[PDB]
Design a binder for this molecule. Structure first.
Ligand SMILES: *[C@@H]1O[C@H](CO)[C@@H](O[C@@H]2O[C@H](CO)[C@@H](O[C@@H]3O[C@H](CO[C@H]4O[C@H](CO)[C@@H](O)[C@H](O)[C@@H]4O)[C@@H](O)[C@H](O[C@H]4O[C@H](CO)[C@@H](O)[C@H](O)[C@@H]4O)[C@@H]3O)[C@H](O)[C@H]2NC(C)=O)[C@H](O)[C@H]1NC(C)=O
Ligand SMILES: *[C@@H]1O[C@H](CO)[C@@H](O[C@@H]2O[C@H](CO)[C@@H](O[C@@H]3O[C@H](CO[C@H]4O[C@H](CO)[C@@H](O)[C@H](O)[C@@H]4O)[C@@H](O)[C@H](O[C@H]4O[C@H](CO)[C@@H](O)[C@H](O)[C@@H]4O)[C@@H]3O)[C@H](O)[C@H]2NC(C)=O)[C@H](O)[C@H]1NC(C)=O
Ligand SMILES: *[C@@H]1O[C@H](CO)[C@@H](O[C@@H]2O[C@H](CO)[C@@H](O[C@@H]3O[C@H](CO[C@H]4O[C@H](CO)[C@@H](O)[C@H](O)[C@@H]4O)[C@@H](O)[C@H](O[C@H]4O[C@H](CO)[C@@H](O)[C@H](O)[C@@H]4O)[C@@H]3O)[C@H](O)[C@H]2NC(C)=O)[C@H](O)[C@H]1NC(C)=O
Ligand SMILES: *[C@@H]1O[C@H](CO)[C@@H](O[C@@H]2O[C@H](CO)[C@@H](O[C@@H]3O[C@H](CO[C@H]4O[C@H](CO)[C@@H](O)[C@H](O)[C@@H]4O)[C@@H](O)[C@H](O[C@H]4O[C@H](CO)[C@@H](O)[C@H](O)[C@@H]4O)[C@@H]3O)[C@H](O)[C@H]2NC(C)=O)[C@H](O)[C@H]1NC(C)=O
Ligand SMILES: *[C@@H]1O[C@H](CO)[C@@H](O[C@@H]2O[C@H](CO)[C@@H](O[C@@H]3O[C@H](CO[C@H]4O[C@H](CO)[C@@H](O)[C@H](O)[C@@H]4O)[C@@H](O)[C@H](O[C@H]4O[C@H](CO)[C@@H](O)[C@H](O)[C@@H]4O)[C@@H]3O)[C@H](O)[C@H]2NC(C)=O)[C@H](O)[C@H]1NC(C)=O
Ligand SMILES: *[C@@H]1O[C@H](CO)[C@@H](O[C@@H]2O[C@H](CO)[C@@H](O[C@@H]3O[C@H](CO[C@H]4O[C@H](CO)[C@@H](O)[C@H](O)[C@@H]4O)[C@@H](O)[C@H](O[C@H]4O[C@H](CO)[C@@H](O)[C@H](O)[C@@H]4O)[C@@H]3O)[C@H](O)[C@H]2NC(C)=O)[C@H](O)[C@H]1NC(C)=O
Ligand SMILES: *[C@@H]1O[C@H](CO)[C@@H](O[C@@H]2O[C@H](CO)[C@@H](O[C@@H]3O[C@H](CO)[C@@H](O)[C@H](O)[C@@H]3O)[C@H](O)[C@H]2NC(C)=O)[C@H](O)[C@H]1NC(C)=O
Ligand SMILES: *[C@@H]1O[C@H](CO)[C@@H](O)[C@H](O)[C@H]1NC(C)=O
Ligand SMILES: *[C@@H]1O[C@H](CO)[C@@H](O)[C@H](O)[C@H]1NC(C)=O
Lengths: 99, 49, 49, 198, 50
């Protein structure tokens, strides 16, 4: 979950944003069957270039391996069918990589 | 001979890189992270190595 | 396998730490491919993987 | 009189103050013997770190007729509360009064001068290294970039868990990837401004 | 007991906690008399199969 001085409740959770709109403070809501909390991750860096997610539990973004987790199962994604969601989509290409 | 002379220096870097039988190769780290006597034992090992 | 001539402009060595400006090495990397997709247009409808 | 420069992953300030408390009573048992021992980590027997920035506070509690006790701690761990307070950056940490694997065990000892000293309890600390949680002597006031730095002069630094003594400068050489660049011997020579790329 | 291997068990009730149960202790020496199989071997008079 990202945000840019626009926090209906993340402002209540921990600080309004921590920066202005151009920076994007983004958390994980620890959404599970019992508890829900927001863990601050980072702000939008000047450049983001590629993404890769591994089964082991670490996602490598731009080639740094920010954080590892347990073995992964799956994922789902949805922006909308609102026109340019695939026209200006960042995914030039996507590949099922293997080691 | 030119290949021969182009040698006998890299391994020197290799040994100094190692941590041998010690918490960390950073002397100051343990220095900051520990009292005197134990680190003294390890640095003796290290200097001897 | 990878067809030649490709730039790999946004491709970077999988490293959990450290940085190498130049050199050569063999290692394990997530480069084998099972399928390929480009210019997606369906993920906006709750696409699952 | 070394200037100090501190730089890590840029971020705001979110400080927390965790307290550990130890309580003992001798005045009634034998003067040296213990009536009751009570240790609380923020009022609990176990706890986990919450904020990136935090500080630990240990409180002592002595009940005795003489009133004089010599305190001592033993550790099975390469870290001490005094040491860790000095801007130790780390990833994950939790504390408990119950035995846990991969948890450092720490004991406290007190000498009431009645003739014999005692030990109170063992604390367990499981943790894994990283750049999430940092322990500081005191917080930072309204700081959106906790890192502090200076150039042109030699300074005592600690960068991403890499501390040393050196003089820092800027170069226009640039690269698209990597933030720190370590010597083959293991010295981070150059590095990049995470926020700006400098 | 005298020079015994110790095993401990930890449990997690999904409350976010992990606690230990107990410790078990073992004495042993290498040898032939007794062996640990994953399934008993039957229909055999000389156990070795090659
Ligand atoms: C963390 O992430 C996991 C996925 O990794 C989530 O698991 C899914 O959660 C969703 C909702 O939270 C589940 O969807 C609902 O499931 C109910 C029962 O579970 C059945 O789901 C499928 C059918 O979809 C079955 O094949 C399966 O065997 C389960 O028995 C359904 O009853 C729900 O349907 C309701 O709405 C429809 C709308 O039309 C009605 O018609 C129905 O009558 C009914 O009222 C709904 O489908 C999904 O099943 C879960 N899947 C898995 C694999 O876990 C977790 O939920 C998430 N954590 C939290 C806290 O949400
Ligand atoms: C990856 O990201 C880059 C960012 O640079 C995109 O490239 C630019 O995209 C913007 C829009 O996202 C383009 O701006 C618009 O260009 C229109 C021309 O049509 C095409 O022209 C470029 C080539 O010059 C194509 O690459 C691109 O796909 C465009 O679709 C103009 O007609 C627009 O003018 C008016 O458009 C709307 C119409 O309603 C108005 O509301 C606007 O206010 C505006 O007045 C607009 O200027 C820009 O031209 C692109 N530049 C280049 C070099 O391509 C990539 O498209 C994007 N690709 C993917 C796959 O994500
Ligand atoms: C930077 O640092 C990280 C941290 O260590 C390194 O990450 C390691 O990456 C290797 C490469 O895959 C991992 O090795 C793999 O370990 C798996 C562990 O699974 C067991 O453990 C889990 C619990 O953790 C159990 O639930 C599970 O059931 C297993 O018992 C293995 O399963 C993998 O098996 C491999 O070999 C088999 C053949 O036997 C193949 O069939 C598999 O496909 C697979 O190839 C594999 O051994 C290692 O675990 C990672 N470390 C950690 C701590 O998890 C990075 O490699 C390191 N370097 C870089 C550049 O990032
Ligand atoms: C450092 O730590 C020591 C402990 O080693 C503190 O000493 C007490 O510690 C206890 C336990 O944590 C704290 O709670 C207190 O309990 C006392 C016990 O009551 C006795 O004394 C009262 C008179 O004061 C008698 O009336 C009673 O019958 C008992 O003989 C009480 O003083 C308090 O509890 C009272 O109120 C509750 C609620 O109303 C009642 O249920 C009790 O029965 C009792 O009436 C008190 O809660 C407390 O922190 C310490 N108490 C005292 C008096 O010192 C040191 O104080 C501590 N030093 C610090 C923190 O600086
Ligand atoms: C590169 O490395 C350097 C350290 O080596 C760091 O750069 C600093 O980054 C921080 C945050 O990114 C900048 O912090 C500044 O804080 C100011 C707050 O103090 C002022 O507060 C009020 C209101 O502004 C003033 O009235 C008062 O007089 C104080 O002076 C902000 O005001 C600053 O905003 C201005 O500068 C930034 C760029 O830094 C612009 O984007 C804004 O629009 C505005 O012009 C700013 O937030 C600090 O200035 C940076 N430089 C230094 C020397 O500290 C970072 O690690 C990295 N670079 C960046 C940009 O992060
Ligand atoms: C050293 O290595 C050599 C070369 O391999 C071995 O020499 C032969 O090894 C085989 C097994 O490896 C021996 O086979 C055994 O024969 C025993 C006696 O044979 C008969 O016994 C009765 C007689 O009526 C009947 O069962 C039947 O007609 C057999 O032909 C058997 O006792 C053995 O298994 C019997 O019992 C099991 C369990 O009840 C049944 O499942 C079997 O069907 C069978 O009835 C086994 O068949 C053979 O005797 C060896 N000598 C020869 C061929 O001359 C050495 O044994 C080996 N030394 C070791 C390992 O110490
Ligand atoms: C864990 O630590 C202590 C446990 O004793 C608790 O927080 C403490 O709260 C007291 C009272 O608010 C603070 O005392 C205050 O000190 C300031 C000066 O710093 C003074 O101006 C005030 O008048 C008051 O005396 C104390 O500093 C503070 N200490 C810490 C470490 O927090 C609380 O249980 C825990 N701390 C938390 C949750 O921050
Ligand atoms: C994506 O889907 C989830 C559930 O399917 C929904 O809650 C969410 O609002 C969707 N995202 C957007 C941007 O609509
Ligand atoms: C600084 O910038 C100048 C601009 O011309 C360049 O010549 C010089 O090499 C740069 N310094 C570096 C790259 O260290």
């Amino acid at each position: 979950v990202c945000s840019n001085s626009s926090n209906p409740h993340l402002a209540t959770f921990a600080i309004p944003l921590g920066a202005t709109q151009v920076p994007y403070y983004c958390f994980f809501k620890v959404d599970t069957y019992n508890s829900t909390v927001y863990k601050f991750l980072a702000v939008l860096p000047p450049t983001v270039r590629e993404i890769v997610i591994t089964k082991y539990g670490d996602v490598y973004v731009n080639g740094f391996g920010y954080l590892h987790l347990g073995l992964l199962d799956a994922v789902t994604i949805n922006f909308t069918g609102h026109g340019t969601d695939d026209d200006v989509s960042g995914f030039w290409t996507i590949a099922s990589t293997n080691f | 001979v030119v290949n021969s002379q182009g040698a006998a220096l890299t391994q020197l870097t290799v040994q100094l890189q190692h941590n041998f039988q010690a918490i960390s190769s950073s002397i100051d780290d343990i220095y900051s992270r520990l009292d005197i006597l134990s680190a003294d034992v390890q640095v003796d090992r290290l200097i001897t190595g | 396998h990878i067809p030649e001539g490709f730039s790999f402009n946004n491709w970077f060595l999988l490293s959990n730490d450290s940085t190498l400006v130049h050199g050569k090495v063999v290692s394990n990397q997530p480069l084998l491919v099972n399928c390929l997709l480009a210019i997606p247009k369906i993920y906006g409808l709750g696409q699952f993987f | 009189e070394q200037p100090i420069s501190f730089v890590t992953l840029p971020s705001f300030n979110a400080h927390s103050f965790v307290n550990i408390t130890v309580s003992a009573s001798f005045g009634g048992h034998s003067g040296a013997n213990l009536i009751a021992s009570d240790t609380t980590i923020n009022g609990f027997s176990s706890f986990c770190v919450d904020t990136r920035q935090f500080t630990i506070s240990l409180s002592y509690n002595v009940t005795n007729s003489y009133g004089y006790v010599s305190n001592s701690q033993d550790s099975n761990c390469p870290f001490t509360l005094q040491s860790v307070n000095d801007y130790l950056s780390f990833s994950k940490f939790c504390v408990s009064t119950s035995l846990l694997a991969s948890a450092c065990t720490i004991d406290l000892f007190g000498y009431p001068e009645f003739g014999s000293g005692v030990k109170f309890t063992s604390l367990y600390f499981q943790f894994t290294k990283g750049e999430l949680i940092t322990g500081t002597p005191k917080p930072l006031e309204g700081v959106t970039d906790v890192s502090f730095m200076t150039l042109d002069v030699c300074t005592k630094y600690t960068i991403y868990g890499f501390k040393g003594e050196g003089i820092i400068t800027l170069t226009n050489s640039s690269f698209l990837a990597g933030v720190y660049y370590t010597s083959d011997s293991g010295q981070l020579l150059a590095f990049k401004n995470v926020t700006s790329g400098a």
